Amino acid sequence: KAFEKKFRFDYTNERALRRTLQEDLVKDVLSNAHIQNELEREFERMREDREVLRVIFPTGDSKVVLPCNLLRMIWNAQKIFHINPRLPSDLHPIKVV
Amino acid sequence: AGILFEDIFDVKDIDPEGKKFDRVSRLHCESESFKMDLILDVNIQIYPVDLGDKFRLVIASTLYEDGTLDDGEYNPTDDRPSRADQFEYVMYGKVYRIEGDETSTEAATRLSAYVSYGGLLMRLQGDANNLHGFEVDSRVYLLMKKLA
Amino acid sequence: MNAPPAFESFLLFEGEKKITINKDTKVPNACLFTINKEDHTLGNIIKSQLLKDPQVLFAGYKVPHPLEHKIIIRVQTTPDYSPQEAFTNAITDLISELSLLEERFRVAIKDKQEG
Amino acid sequence: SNRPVMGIVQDTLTAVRKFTKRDVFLERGEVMNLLMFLSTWDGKVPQPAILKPRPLWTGKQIFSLIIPGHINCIRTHSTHPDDEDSGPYKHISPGDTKVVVENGELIMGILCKKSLGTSAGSLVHISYLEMGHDITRLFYSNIQ
Structure with missing residues (x-):
């Protein structure tokens, strides 16, 4: 339940949509169907990766060693581009995918 | 103007947990007519404060009494603009976090602005309506003056 | 074997200049003075006197290595005033203070003995 | 072991903690000296934290000038309790633990072996991985 809530991208409530994504993007998200199909396929791929991870790492250890520090890169991007977290953004989730 | 906030506070505690530092004490003030809690660390050696004191707090984005910003570079030989020198205690910081009372759908009604001097x-803390002048990474001045 | 002679800490050799003036290109109206064969005995007085000047915005000194005798002084001043003028005024004021101090000490000695 | 093999050793390390306490307020002349010993300094003296009734800087306000570039990091002091992260004052930290470096400025926290030391993810490790050897070298020298 926590995994689905954290990684699902509910596109139905539409109030979270108006609060987080911009107005010209929320109408696009609510109108298109190819966007919705891609967004559901992304979560399907994430679920399969979750099962693969659980097979590779029993005993539930998250700590791992990998080459790129994604969270610190995201923090640097936020500070470099003066991102304000209190406002809706202009990033299209299809562009993200 | 450039005055983001202005209110009169009363000191309720000086160190509820204990004296953590020799020359710094943490006031726990509460507002009047605004109902806005404050948690401020004040150099007590330079500016002594004791219980029950009332001071007028002003938080301003500039000191120059006309609107122009300061660029953050120190210069003492600039008395010409006649900065806001009617206060006793002045500090200079940078707001680094604005917590809120948001949720998935409803907007926030109470904010909490942190500034590091x-x-x-x-x-x-306080209401979300009079706390709108604060944006993160923005330089902010603090001005205090004890009322007798 | 590798011991430098003791007199090398205060004697300028053939070719060495006592003081050389260089500008600082990072900030306007800044200048660096390099003094050879000196130490804190002069650096501290000159710095503390430069700080008294209200038209001096920066004034410091440092010894880059304790085994090599050389003093670097950096002073930045407000426009319509030059760091060379600030330096010369500082030295003149120090000399005046020392002369007055010597006069008063001599008169105090005279008062103390046979008086 | 993909960790920095060299770090601050015990004398700058016993003194950076005292420098980075909250109480350290520096006079104008002391700031002049310390900036005179900075090799990667722009040339502009930052605005003092305490501006009235006497201009006073702070140890963190100068270690911010020492820290290079725009480095973002979050460490934890060696005397950080097990209740601050849970209860209130999570981001206020009464004892001045929970080191935070945003945009190359030491916003809060006390620096110790767990921040400047030879451990993974420390401030020096982040400085290396972000800026390179040529800037980490100056980092070490300026700190010392």
């Missing part, structure tokens, strides 16, 4: 922190 080169180590000496400050949290200023």
Whole structure:
């Protein structure tokens, strides 16, 4: 339940949509169907990766060693581009995918 | 103007947990007519404060009494603009976090702005309507003056 | 074997200049003075006197290595005033203070003995 | 072991903690000296934290000038309790633990072996991985 809530991208409530994504993007998200199909396929791929991870790492250890520090890169991007977290953004989730 | 906030506070505690530092004490003030809690660290050696004191707090984005910003570069030989020198205690910090009472759908009704004055922190909770002048990474001045 | 002679800490050799003036290109109206064969005995007085001047915005000194005798002084001043003028005024004021101090000490000695 | 093999050793390390306490307020002349010993300094003296009734800087306000570039990091002091992260004052930290470096400025926290030391993810490790050897070398020298 926590995994689905954290990684699902509910596109139905539409109030979270108006609060987080911009107005010209929320109408696009609510109108298109190819966007919705891609967004559901992304979560399907994430679920399969979750099962693969659980097979590779029993005993539930998250700590791992990998080459790129994604969270610190995201923090640097936020500070470099003066991102304000209190406002809706202009990033299209299809562009993200 | 450039005055983001202005209110009169009363000191309720000086160190509820204990004396953590020799020359720094953490005031726990509460507002009047605004109902805005404050948690401020004040150099007490230079500016002594004791219980029950009332001071007028002003938080301004500039000191120059006309609107122009300062660029953050120190210069003492600039008395020409006649800065806001009617206060006793002045600090200079950078707001680093604006917590809120948001949710998935409803917007926020109470905010909490944190400012770091080169180590000496400050949290200023209250209503979300009079706390709108604060944006993160923005330089902010603090001005205090004890009322007799 | 590798011991430098003791007199090398205060004697300028053939070719060495006592003081050389260089500008600082990072900030306007800044200048660096390099003094050879000196130490804190002069650096501290000159710095503390430069700080008294209200038209001096920066004034410091440092010894880059304790085994090599050389003093670097950096002073930045407000426009319509030059760091060379600030330096010369500082030295003149120090000399005046020392002369007055010597006069008063001599008169105090005279008062103390046979008086 | 993909960790920095060299770090601050015990004398700058016993003194950076005292420098980075909250109480350290520096006079104008002391700031002049310390900036005179900075090799990667722009040339502009930052605005003092305490501006009235006497201009006073702070140890963190100068370690911010020492820290290079725009480095973002979050460490934890060696005397950080097990209740601050849970209860209130999570981001206020009464004892001045929970080191935070945003945009190359030491916003809060006390620096110790767990921040400047030879451990993974420390401030020096982040400085290396972000800026390179040529800037980490100056980092070490300026700190010392």
